[PDB]
Write a protein that binds this ligand. Structure first.
Ligand SMILES: Cc1ncc(COP(=O)(O)O)c(C=O)c1O
Ligand SMILES: Cc1ncc(COP(=O)(O)O)c(C=O)c1O
Ligand SMILES: [Mg+2]
Lengths: 428, 428
């Protein structure tokens, strides 16, 4: 019961990129983007009297309530009320690609698809699940990770999560355990999640470390394992030290292996301080035109059959600020500088000699968060005590670790927060 | 299966075994995580909340003034932060209030609190996730929206079974639905009820709704579990004396545990806000446990798919629900415009001069009407209308075309149908 259109797409992808086809889930194979009506509706645009549009319109555009239109500035009614395409507003796709190219000097436009707009990064992850993750596939990811990966990939998609450490005994970042995991990996397919800056540790690797990671992934690919390399760039750009500042997507795409499919998920969510906008992007690392076209068709079908399309007003808002808007650039830079100064205070406080008996920080240099391994006490007992007595909210990640978001603590408040954590530990 | 899902399932089984029996495999496995989310809500009343995955300062969330400048009347905390996965709680309340106002025979005790979705398609997708197994059957009219197939067949692997809703003479009939329900031979069905209809613009009378819901009750009592999806995309766009409550109300008032009504409605068409992506999902049940378990599972489904929906458009819909006087008048005017176009369409479609050209399917609502064209192929007609007459219409099937008066000014409608008649004569 596969649609002829899906079969057509599959055959084209098989001829041009058999490994990419082999990576598709069952849903991935069955998906396509329907013609018929869209083509009919498209053909109607050349007519004086277009009676095909499923929206209320009149002589000068869409019908709308002026009272709703009044809640926006700088956007035309056509940038607010109509449907966005399932793939997102085409201009936005262009402008976001331009931004990526600016941020990633070593990335070539020929080596990627045009970014497709998603309902932010979670939707991107869900789309990866739809398109490439079968029940009982394996997700390979650090033991320090975002809890929603499990709900997306295990609970929704039926995959297994296999974890590997990314910090050693002394709380310092290490690639050794990833390399060991890749060397022992015994299946013909893996989906890897790479999230740097990291939630929950706020670590971004050095170029040295990135090289090691991507060379290790290439070695796995060459052993006969197909690698879907999901690059979760939620905190991209929030870099406070001399680290690798391109996306790992670029490093991975520049390997030029047909057995590795890099997928970049990025967006406005944290980069543009726009969490509720729900504007993100999905980009494939491939130089093959057919692959680009078939994957775009399938993603369009996946989006159409899930949410139809994303929010036009917030897509339009993001589109506008991408057009070399120097004021917006400065505002983002200011905001990131605030985070960097908070990071700097956090570094000075967390590594002070007086707290060496209280915790061991995991390396951090980016993002929103850092984590500490609390000594001789339960992180859960510590958390509730901090809420009850000190009026401080922290996250207990696991049996040993606490996460603190310096993203929501003012610079002047940070020493108090950490000193209160140390006192709270000493209490128990 | 996660322990939390097992917990929810056991509670549902004890309180509403049939509702549990309706769940898909995904539906059974879903839950809403505690862990890190629970820890965050416990710290909401802390002075220093360092658990939030956002950037904040003393004033509230951090943001770019250039983006904030694109909105009026909304505060930044109504624009930039995350919405909850279930939607802004105030919006849920206000929409429920609207539903109650629109549906006098609906009791607040007999429904869940509406959950916000990314408009109605997301609602349909969620029904698919939660209740549709591969090879389940969707029972729906043969006149239907093409995306139902992509959502339920292509994405979810269900079969569509159609039944006619118009007789020989283009007149609406419940006879074929009753016949279909009497012969239906499986233990589960997912029905889709879409009135006003796409593509025919028909809404049934009180009389007809009674027949429909009595027939569905009879099927339920034979031992078939009925998920009754009420697609209210065009709700409120009523131009004749028809049933003006949602069919959700009629179905909920049956009080059968073997029928689970699910209402999908939203701002999309009701508020002339297609690109906003604000819709709602409501369950027809009087059982508190059912309400809580289904909400938990839907939250998990949303969290693992899109995370959350767009805050700015949710906040906008909230605002026009609260500050409503002017907005309500503007919407009323737009609907009056649609009514007048309908009235012209009726006057013209049934004029004697066109008796040989087509047979209209009954219509009284929404955006569209359909005609059965005499003696000519709709596709050939559609192409010829574009080429010679500069008229754009949709060819639905082997005999019918759809005309959207939603996008044709009142004074141009007679010309459109004049040209359709002329084009038909050209081809026969
Ligand atoms: C690592 C990581 N990925 C993805 C997300 C989700 O981002 P979004 O809000 O854009 O869906 C978050 C939260 C996150 O911390
Ligand atoms: C029957 C029907 N349901 C749903 C929709 C679209 O709903 P939404 O844009 O809110 O996802 C339309 C189009 C429609 O005609
Ligand atoms: Mg999958």
């Amino acid at each position: 019961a596969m649609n002829p259109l899906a079969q057509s797409l599959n055959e084209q992808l098989q001829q041009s990129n058999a490994t990419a086809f082999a990576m598709l889930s069952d849903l991935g194979q069955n998906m396509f983007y329907p013609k018929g009506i869209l083509s009919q509706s498209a053909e109607a645009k050349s007519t004086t009297y277009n009676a095909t549009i499923g929206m209320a319109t009149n002589k000068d555009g869409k019908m709308f309530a002026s009272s709703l239109d009044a809640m926006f500035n700088d956007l035309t009614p056509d940038e607010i009320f109509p449907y966005a395409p399932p793939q997102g507003i085409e201009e936005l796709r262009d402008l976001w690609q331009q931004k990526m190219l600016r941020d990633n000097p070593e990335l070539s436009i020929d080596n990627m698809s045009r970014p497709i707009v998603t309902n932010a990064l979670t939707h991107g992850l869900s789309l990866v699940g739809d398109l490439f993750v079968n029940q009982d596939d394996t997700i390979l990811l650090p033991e320090h990770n975002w809890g929603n990966y499990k709900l997306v990939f295990n609970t929704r998609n039926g995959a297994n999560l296999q974890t590997y450490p990314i910090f050693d005994k002394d709380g310092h970042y290490t690639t050794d355990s990833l390399v060991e995991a890749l060397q022992s990996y015994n299946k013909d397919k893996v989906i890897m999640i790479l999230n740097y800056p990291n939630n929950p540790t706020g670590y971004t690797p050095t170029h040295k470390e990135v090289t090691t990671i991507v060379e290790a992934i290439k070695a796995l690919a060459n052993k006969g394992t197909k690698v879907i390399a999901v690059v979760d760039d939620a905190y991209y750009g929030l870099f406070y030290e001399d680290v690798y500042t391109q996306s790992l997507f670029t490093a991975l795409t520049n390997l030029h292996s047909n057995a590795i499919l890099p997928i970049r998920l990025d967006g406005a969510t944290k980069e543009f301080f726009a969490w509720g906008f729900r504007v993100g992007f999905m980009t494939f690392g491939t130089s093959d035109q057919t692959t680009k076209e078939v994957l775009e068709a399938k993603v369009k079908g996946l989006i159409r059959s899930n949410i139809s399309s994303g929010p036009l007003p917030t897509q339009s808002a993001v589109k506008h600020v991408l057009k070399n808007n120097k004021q917006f650039d400065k505002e983002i830079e200011q905001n990131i500088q605030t985070l960097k100064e908070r990071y700097e205070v956090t570094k000075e406080v967390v590594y002070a000699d007086q707290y060496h008996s209280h915790w061991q920080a995991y390396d951090f240099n980016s993002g929103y968060f850092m984590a500490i391994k609390v000594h001789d006490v339960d992180p859960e007992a510590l958390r509730k005590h901090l809420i009850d007595k000190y009026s401080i909210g922290v996250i207990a990640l696991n049996a040993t670790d606490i996460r603190i978001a310096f993203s929501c603590v003012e610079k002047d408040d940070i020493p108090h927060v950490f000193d209160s954590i140390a006192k709270a530990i000493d209490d128990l």
